[PDB]
Design an enzyme around this catalytic site. Structure first.
Site, mmCIF file in Angstrom:
data_model
loop_
_atom_site.group_PDB
_atom_site.id
_atom_site.type_symbol
_atom_site.label_atom_id
_atom_site.label_comp_id
_atom_site.label_asym_id
_atom_site.label_seq_id
_atom_site.Cartn_x
_atom_site.Cartn_y
_atom_site.Cartn_z
ATOM 1 N N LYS B 76 0.852 -1.169 0.003
ATOM 2 C CA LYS B 76 -0.092 0.012 0.043
ATOM 3 C C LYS B 76 0.919 1.175 0.118
ATOM 4 O O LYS B 76 1.575 1.333 0.756
ATOM 5 C CB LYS B 76 -1.109 -0.170 1.305
ATOM 6 C CG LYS B 76 -1.722 1.364 1.294
ATOM 7 C CD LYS B 76 -2.671 1.299 2.258
ATOM 8 C CE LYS B 76 -2.448 1.504 3.848
ATOM 9 N NZ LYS B 76 -3.410 1.648 4.670
ATOM 10 N N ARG B 120 -10.400 -1.469 6.222
ATOM 11 C CA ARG B 120 -9.685 -2.418 6.826
ATOM 12 C C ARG B 120 -9.480 -1.758 8.402
ATOM 13 O O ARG B 120 -9.457 -2.547 9.452
ATOM 14 C CB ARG B 120 -8.463 -2.926 6.086
ATOM 15 C CG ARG B 120 -7.465 -1.959 6.071
ATOM 16 C CD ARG B 120 -6.501 -1.626 7.507
ATOM 17 N NE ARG B 120 -5.357 -1.281 6.792
ATOM 18 C CZ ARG B 120 -4.387 -0.587 7.721
ATOM 19 N NH1 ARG B 120 -5.099 0.326 8.901
ATOM 20 N NH2 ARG B 120 -3.211 0.148 7.469
ATOM 21 N N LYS B 240 -0.630 9.643 28.078
ATOM 22 C CA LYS B 240 0.198 8.485 28.236
ATOM 23 C C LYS B 240 -0.371 7.818 29.351
ATOM 24 O O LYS B 240 -0.170 6.575 29.504
ATOM 25 C CB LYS B 240 1.414 8.953 28.784
ATOM 26 C CG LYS B 240 1.998 9.957 27.455
ATOM 27 C CD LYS B 240 3.402 10.409 27.774
ATOM 28 C CE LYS B 240 4.562 9.814 27.101
ATOM 29 N NZ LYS B 240 5.819 10.432 26.902
HETATM 30 N N1 LIG Z 1 -4.217 3.172 12.948
HETATM 31 C C1 LIG Z 1 -4.610 2.950 11.780
HETATM 32 O O1 LIG Z 1 -4.158 2.028 11.147
HETATM 33 C C2 LIG Z 1 -5.040 4.128 10.772
HETATM 34 C C3 LIG Z 1 -5.515 3.783 9.367
HETATM 35 C C4 LIG Z 1 -5.734 4.723 8.527
HETATM 36 C C5 LIG Z 1 -5.848 6.294 9.063
HETATM 37 N N2 LIG Z 1 -5.386 6.308 10.450
HETATM 38 C C6 LIG Z 1 -5.604 7.937 10.907
HETATM 39 O O2 LIG Z 1 -7.100 7.904 11.068
HETATM 40 C C7 LIG Z 1 -6.911 9.497 11.137
HETATM 41 C C8 LIG Z 1 -8.242 10.123 10.642
HETATM 42 O O3 LIG Z 1 -7.980 10.364 9.053
HETATM 43 P P1 LIG Z 1 -9.108 10.745 8.147
HETATM 44 O O4 LIG Z 1 -8.685 10.392 6.615
HETATM 45 O O5 LIG Z 1 -10.658 10.713 8.376
HETATM 46 O O6 LIG Z 1 -8.775 12.522 8.321
HETATM 47 P P2 LIG Z 1 -9.788 13.678 7.912
HETATM 48 O O7 LIG Z 1 -8.932 14.841 7.699
HETATM 49 O O8 LIG Z 1 -10.835 12.965 6.903
HETATM 50 O O9 LIG Z 1 -10.702 13.912 9.124
HETATM 51 C C9 LIG Z 1 -10.045 14.354 10.486
HETATM 52 C C10 LIG Z 1 -11.206 14.736 11.191
HETATM 53 O O10 LIG Z 1 -10.828 15.116 12.437
HETATM 54 C C11 LIG Z 1 -11.294 16.326 12.889
HETATM 55 N N3 LIG Z 1 -10.276 16.555 14.135
HETATM 56 C C12 LIG Z 1 -8.951 17.058 13.744
HETATM 57 N N4 LIG Z 1 -8.150 17.264 14.988
HETATM 58 C C13 LIG Z 1 -9.237 16.905 15.872
HETATM 59 C C14 LIG Z 1 -9.348 17.203 17.446
HETATM 60 N N5 LIG Z 1 -8.161 17.583 17.983
HETATM 61 N N6 LIG Z 1 -10.365 16.846 18.019
HETATM 62 C C15 LIG Z 1 -11.337 16.522 17.346
HETATM 63 N N7 LIG Z 1 -11.633 16.349 16.119
HETATM 64 C C16 LIG Z 1 -10.432 16.632 15.243
HETATM 65 C C17 LIG Z 1 -11.141 17.289 11.581
HETATM 66 O O11 LIG Z 1 -11.933 18.502 11.577
HETATM 67 C C18 LIG Z 1 -11.941 16.116 10.724
HETATM 68 O O12 LIG Z 1 -13.141 16.107 10.450
HETATM 69 C C19 LIG Z 1 -5.821 10.081 10.796
HETATM 70 O O13 LIG Z 1 -4.965 10.514 11.816
HETATM 71 C C20 LIG Z 1 -5.092 8.798 10.093
HETATM 72 O O14 LIG Z 1 -3.626 8.843 10.223
HETATM 73 C C21 LIG Z 1 -5.169 5.341 11.189
#
Ligand SMILES: NC(=O)c1ccc[n+]([C@@H]2O[C@H](COP(=O)([O-])OP(=O)(O)OC[C@H]3O[C@@H](n4cnc5c(N)ncnc54)[C@H](O)[C@@H]3O)[C@@H](O)[C@H]2O)c1
Ligand SMILES: NC(=O)c1ccc[n+]([C@@H]2O[C@H](COP(=O)([O-])OP(=O)(O)OC[C@H]3O[C@@H](n4cnc5c(N)ncnc54)[C@H](O)[C@@H]3O)[C@@H](O)[C@H]2O)c1
Lengths: 334, 334
Positions: B76, B120, B240
């Protein structure tokens, strides 16, 4: 949102089948390298058998970003099975290059990788030879008659009209035979010689290019003519003594070469080599920070691990040419 | 030689738009993980500004190989610009998944990545909740209303018919407002509550899922109801103290979590956490090597960095379904 798909045929049609596009692209990328205007994280090797696995059975991920006027990002994802040609009648290596718009990071192109990989690797030999080979050299040696050897040879002949003779060796005699036969007809005015052993081929070359798949060195220092330039494209062919004894050692990228388990790192780990000892990085020659060949007795070794910015710059130039010519298949991302 | 191209529409048509395919694919991959039948080299981050760069401006390469009956390899390649939605009206993340035949290593599919990545990741929350949430939990919390939040919510509702209420918070109020409005119509029988702050949302959830883009923790331990399960998908949200105070901490992969500069590694580097302290890897719960939730007072934290085998297994299942339905665009490699 759209991406351009370019298969190998489309890449050829867009100029990817001639060395000059690669030479141009790499001269640019290597200048960006010298000026540190790039980012190139270390390449991971995915191996099914990290224990009990042939060294050429892998898929390598090679991401990079090049800065500048026409900044670009991307990845080469390039697989290999040593066995593919002999057992399956398939090219050893295969894969894809993805290009990404650095403004949004979105992918913008998906391209076949192996022609571009082979040609950019050949361009590395061309550019290095411009700086490191005897001017007007007549005798070229190729060891290994696969796709990399073919492109190394094609590009050198395109780029150096003074080459008179080409000594060719392959461990598999028939591959050598057919290779020289094909080329002798492609270029009747050059003299191709299928040699009996590697020593004969290496001994007779002013520029020597290694294009095998081996994990054991066979090239001895005393095989090399004074004045020789060796482009060690397949990396493992060259005995350690050559790194030690060559008048000048050049790499593409020190940090990549001086990496755990690699030839240079090993000489470094012993007290036999260092960064001080290294003559130049290739980009420094291109930009003129460091001189290349300074006399015709020098024996010079290039040891280029291969850099993602070379693939990405090459693919980007070809993508642009293809768009200019409306070549390729438009895909929708969504 | 051919490859199948599947855009997001094709992925949806082939079943990629429903959680069950992801749950099935991940249960398989996580079993392979528990049995160590995979290889997953560390992910490189390509950043244009490794210094002076927003934490969500990157492209990540995520290669893996899964063994077994239907072994598969792939990568990916997923880009992000924090700015894309607010400044460009584009999804934050984008990219491609390449699948590779492990016999030859040749690429066989090029697929859009972001729907699969989001689904996923939602399946990770589903499977973990099956093992770690109170049975029959009624109150779900979502923090962050982007694509990840949307899919987390969709999948939980698909997979847990007992959910009654959904507390939703976003730092950007309007995003929250529209998010709950849309969902309230999608599911009239569930009660969606747009909360005034994160504390209200977190305090009222039996399962809490973090889906923001932040580099600073805001979730406090005392916000959490006894019995809560927190799926910390966006990683940085959780103070933490929660890692320290939770009755059980679960990760997807320890070696990936206990990695230089990361929350768990930092607690480890201090003397506040260790592998002994860790309750399980997710695959061990799936295979039954280690029990999940054992009572309803336990506070349980899942901290999943995300694993390439999840994307590759998911994409492989979808590729297969698409081939079965003759969905997608056949490309020639050459
Ligand atoms: N753990 C994993 O395997 C995994 C996989 C994919 C994505 N992610 C993470 O998922 C997260 C979300 O991604 P997305 O594509 O939906 O992003 P996105 O930009 O579409 O949405 C993020 C949302 O969070 C809001 N936001 C930002 N900071 C905030 C805060 N401090 N408190 C409350 N709301 C807040 C924004 O206004 C927005 O609506 C990303 O950080 C990405 O890295 C993790
Ligand atoms: N430095 C770089 O950036 C770079 C880039 C691309 C490829 N490569 C390397 O180029 C090499 C050649 O690749 P290819 O795709 O042409 O492989 P290939 O399988 O098509 O051909 C290899 C050829 O070498 C011959 N050979 C093998 N061992 C030999 C030996 N010990 N002595 C003489 N001949 C031998 C084989 O019979 C075959 O004809 C590979 O090792 C690849 O990793 C290096």
């Amino acid at each position: 949102r759209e991406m351009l798909y370019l298969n190998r045929s489309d890449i050829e049609q867009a100029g990817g089948n001639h060395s000059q596009v690669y030479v141009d692209a790499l001269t640019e990328a290597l200048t960006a390298h010298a000026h540190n205007d790039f980012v190139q994280p270390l390449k991971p090797y995915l191996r099914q058998d990290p224990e009990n696995g042939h060294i050429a059975d892998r898929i390598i991920a090679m991401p990079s970003h090049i800065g500048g006027e026409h900044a670009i990002s991307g990845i080469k994802w390039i697989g290999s099975k040593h066995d593919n040609p002999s057992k399956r009648n398939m090219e050893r290596a295969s894969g894809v290059i993805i290009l990404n718009d650095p403004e949004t990071n979105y992918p913008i192109a998906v391209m076949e990788a192996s022609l571009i990989s082979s040609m950019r690797t050949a361009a590395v030999s061309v550019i290095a030879a411009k700086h490191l080979a005897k001017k007007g050299f007549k005798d070229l040696t190729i060891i290994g008659c696969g796709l990399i050897g073919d492109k190394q040879l094609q590009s050198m002949l395109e780029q150096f009209d003074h080459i008179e003779r080409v000594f060719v060796y392959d461990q598999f005699s028939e591959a050598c035979a057919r290779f020289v036969d094909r080329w002798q007809q492609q270029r009747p005015e050059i003299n191709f010689i299928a040699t009996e052993n590697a020593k004969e081929a290496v001994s007779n070359g002013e520029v020597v290019i290694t294009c095998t798949v081996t994990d054991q060195p066979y090239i001895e220092y005393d095989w090399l003519q004074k004045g020789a330039f060796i482009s060690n494209i397949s990396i493992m062919d060259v005995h350690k003594e050559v790194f030690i004894k060559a008048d000048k050692v050049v790499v593409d990228d020190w940090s990549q070469c001086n990496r755990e388990k690699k030839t240079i790192n090993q000489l470094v780990l012993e007290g036999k080599f260092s960064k001080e000892a290294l003559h130049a990085e290739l980009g420094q020659l291109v930009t003129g920070d460091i001189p290349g060949r300074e006399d015709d007795d020098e024996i010079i070794l290039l040891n280029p691990m291969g850099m993602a910015i070379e693939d990405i710059s090459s693919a980007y130039f070809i993508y642009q040419q293809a768009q200019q010519q409306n070549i390729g298949t438009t895909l929708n991302l969504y």
